[PDB]
Each structure stands twice: as structure tokens, then as C-alpha cells.
Design a protein around this ligand. Sequence first.
Ligand code: HEC
Ligand code: HEC
Lengths: 104, 104
Amino acid sequence: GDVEKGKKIFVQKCAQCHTVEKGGKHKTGPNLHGLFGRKTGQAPGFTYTDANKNKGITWKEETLMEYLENPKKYIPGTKMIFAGIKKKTEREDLIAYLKKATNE
Amino acid sequence: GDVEKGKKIFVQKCAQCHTVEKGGKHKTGPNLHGLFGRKTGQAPGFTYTDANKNKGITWKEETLMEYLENPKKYIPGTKMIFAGIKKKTEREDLIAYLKKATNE
Ligand code: HEC
Ligand code: HEC
């Protein structure tokens, strides 16, 4: 496998949701450091879907190859969920901005 | 509603997938200009999910307040699916980079 190319692909298709650095922060997705040898859905502090939580497989070259070709196929139920906004005043302020900008 | 606050929220939580300016572009999500007083899934040239496409309700403060607190709940089926990496060589390259970066 070609590392330099893989780095570019990661930066374009994955970096937006995942960090790989040790101690890396969780974003939309979980930090991926120490991924090889780790079972699905074990990154401490992250909230996985039951699908990702129960896949029951170990991440490594082979599993990643199948998974990466089509995530939903390998782990039916895996998806990105649009983060809700629980605070009422925040939703009110956001809508006020939306009402103005989407109409100007 | 506090426009100034909504503006910051929008930019930090929504701008990455949505643009609101008239003639704006579609990103991971559709441009939201003209959103109010119009039914769901009406953005020209954007392919929504059947879920978002058939919610049928009309966007306005009321409906937006309920939707924003929990998208999935107000529109069962709305989500983002993880795109696969069709090219076998890219998957290999990506995996090599991950193997390097997640251990170092
Ligand atoms: C956000 C829009 C993401 C993009 C783009 C990518 N992934 Fe992701 N990934 C994301 C989340 C929120 C999740 C968990 C979803 C769930 O079902 O709970 C994941 C998970 C993974 C995993 C598994 C991690 C684990 O089990 O600990 C891997 C290995 C993974 N994603 C890899 C990955 C790569 C390499 C991406 C680009 C090709 C990529 N993801 C993009 C969110 C997002
Ligand atoms: C990218 C990950 C997104 C983020 C972050 C936000 N939204 Fe989004 N939004 C996104 C998509 C891909 C879709 C459509 C999905 C589908 O089911 O087809 C949407 C949809 C909306 C809509 C409805 C548009 C319509 O009915 O025409 C609204 C009102 C909306 N999104 C608003 C919104 C706001 C204000 C966000 C941040 C607070 C936000 N979304 C983030 C993708 C993404």
C-alpha cells in the first residue's frame, strides 16, 4: 500500500470526521488511533450506533478493505446522524438568522 | 430571535454542509435560500432522500424548531450514508496510511 497517496485520500474523504493522531479528538466520528487490533465500537467516550457497537469484528487490513468499499453494506445501520440542537434559545437564534439570510 | 448568535451557531454547526446565500451552492447539504414558506425537499438540483423528499410539511419557525431539536426524529430516514471507496488501489493506499498513522 502507498502511504503518501493514502494520506491524501484520508485528508479529502475522512479528515472531516476523523482524527488519527494519538490523543486525537473525537469529531463527528471517533479518533482512529490504535485501530488495528481493535474491535468495532470501542473508542472510549464516543457514542456509536447499536450497529457499530455490535458488529463484533476486529479492525485490520482485511475487514477495513471490505468495510471501506461500502460502510452500510458491511455494517447495516451505520450512518451519520445530523446532530440535534437541544437548547431552545439556540434553536430560536439559529432560526432567526436563517429567516433573515435565506430571505435576503 | 438573536440574529448575531444564530449566525455564529450556523457557521459552527451548519455552514460546513449548507450555504444560505441566494444562488448559493449545494454542498453535502442543499443551499437553504428560500427555505421558509416552502415544503421540504424543494431545493433545485439537490437529491434528497425519499424521507426528506416526502415529509411534505412546510418549513417555518414552528416546524424548524421541532426539526432542529432532533432531525432523525422529525424526519425518520434523514441521515448521511458513508461513501465507499470503490477503487481497490485507493482502499489499499488509504489502509497503509491508517496503519502508519494510527500506530505512530
Ligand atoms: C463523517 C461525515 C464521516 C466520514 C466522512 C467518515 N466517517 Fe468514519 N465514521 C463516522 C462515524 C460517526 C462513525 C460511526 C458511525 C456508527 O455507526 O456509529 C464512523 C466510524 C468509522 C469507523 C469505525 C470506528 C470504530 O468502530 O471504532 C472507521 C474505521 C471509519 N469510520 C473510517 C473512516 C474512514 C477511513 C473514512 C474515510 C474514507 C471515514 N470513516 C469517513 C463518520 C465519518
Ligand atoms: C452535513 C453533515 C450537514 C450538516 C452539518 C447539517 N446538515 Fe442540514 N442537511 C444535510 C443534508 C445532506 C440534508 C438532506 C438530507 C436528506 O434527508 O435528504 C440536510 C437537510 C436540512 C434541511 C432541510 C432542507 C429541505 O427540506 O429542503 C434543513 C432545514 C437543514 N438541513 C438545516 C441544517 C442546519 C440549520 C444545520 C445546522 C444547525 C444543518 N442542517 C447541518 C446535511 C447537513
